[PDB]
């Protein structure tokens, strides 16, 4: 049914993507029943934040790169089941984790996941998430360093 | 240099969402001369942004979706070199186009992209552009049939 | 129950194959699964690969005779679609079935074959390989329209 | 300029034959570019595929015995990675070179194989198969953790 449609929009977002060399695409499907609206709206992008000039510092600054600096911060997982009932800041589920280095040196960048899905609603990131998370910018870590060093 | 960091921040983001059905997913590199701040923040996102209640139809009033009724409003691509500077609607460049259907019946729906890039900087979308846009809805707006009727 | 946890791991085996694909540069990725049941044999061997088979400039002439090329040559010939149920039980072309879906893909004007796409053995959710049918054709036939211009955009 | 568009090209092809597969639900995708220097030749043909190649429920103790799982058997019961630069100049298993980099998939506690990654031929931009090095060594050895952790999850 509507989890086959929901597949092709994604599929037809990364591709086009993939294709055009676009930040932004937004497929909108004509609701059946109110012309005037849409029935599905799903919407992809890819984008580098920053090509700036530290004007790069003040961006720190923002409250969406809040949790950011907040593991940065701490070199530990967060992990906000319900951001809109959390009460140590200031969308709704959220894992961010750090991702470190090689000889765990320090600190070189943060994954951020907003919504962990059902395969659904929206839910919290679980133990077993960060678990994965983890070993999983273990590699990235790793890949990020090779090309500045090569 | 930093183009294949650029890279393989886009497939680590890719990856991630693949692996965790998660909605949103952000790489913060921790700039190297300042430790405070972001050198790159890559971020990439894919939802279905309406299951409400037609609750749909209000979303549709709303000033992102301008561009989207514009074009199911006119059967016809719509092209803006830079919005910032733009006249007819009160994110620079936008390509926006009609996924028609099999035997051009109607509207089925509206890809917009945005921001064209350079093989670079971001760019507006040429005929060029709108040429390929237009090839590809066909096969979309084949497939998004299918997932309905079978 | 059971057969929820194989789906599952094969769309994992394809991600992950995917993945290391895209990430280190390589025609070929083979992941194998140890089968839990005894140790000394392999539960999934799950294949995925990329390369351009011409890296050669003419000598072309002779591969492009080779037999495996042969629905190629009768679709490009041809200029229209070929769709075979079963490779094997097919007679103008010299068990687990084999299906095959072979289209053109022409120029803006349809007057010339640039290229062609070739598509073996769709497949059902784990389901078995099934034959192409005429959505398949359609889609297909709608799908490399598009090809086309990026193509030709590329030989610019 | 001229070596500028068929980079270029190959790029497009891949995209091409990933996103048909993808939409499709094929195993093999298969574009033939025509060479517009005479039109019997193919001047591109670039294949990729997907598919699991254990469809069948023992019947895999023989598989698991085949020539080309060789590599794999000999990682899985050594525990170890394995990297041969080409495989033909090898001489413990029984011109264009091929490139081979095969590393084991252990559990959480790494006191056991659940799976293995094979990866063949490691390429250069349009460059020449290489060697796979200490790096592609290193990478895949972290990348092979979480696919560890991945499967796993899904055996339940």
């Given at each position: 049914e509507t989890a086959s449609l929901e597949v092709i929009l994604k599929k037809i977002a990364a591709t086009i993507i993939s294709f055009m060399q676009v930040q932004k695409c937004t497929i909108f499907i004509v609701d059946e029943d109110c012309s005037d609206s849409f029935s599905s709206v799903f919407?992809?992008?890819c984008?580098?934040?920053?090509?700036?000039?530290?004007?790069?510092?003040?961006?720190?600054?923002?409250?969406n790169y809040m949790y950011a600096?907040?593991?940065?911060?701490?070199?530990?997982?967060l992990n906000i089941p319900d951001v809109?009932?959390?009460?140590?800041?200031?969308?709704?589920?959220?894992?961010?984790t750090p991702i470190?280095?090689?000889?765990?040196?320090?600190?070189?960048?943060?994954?951020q996941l907003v919504n962990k899905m059902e395969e659904g609603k929206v839910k919290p990131f679980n133990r077993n998430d960060e678990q994965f998370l983890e070993a999983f910018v273990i590699?990235?870590?790793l890949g990020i360093q090779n090309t500045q060093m090569y």
């Open positions: 919407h992809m992008e984008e580098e934040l920053e090509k700036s000039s530290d004007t790069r510092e003040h961006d720190a600054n923002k409250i600096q907040y593991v940065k911060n701490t070199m530990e997982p809109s009932k959390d009460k140590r800041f200031p969308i709704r589920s959220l894992l961010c470190k280095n090689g000889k765990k040196n320090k600190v070189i960048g943060v994954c590699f990235c870590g």
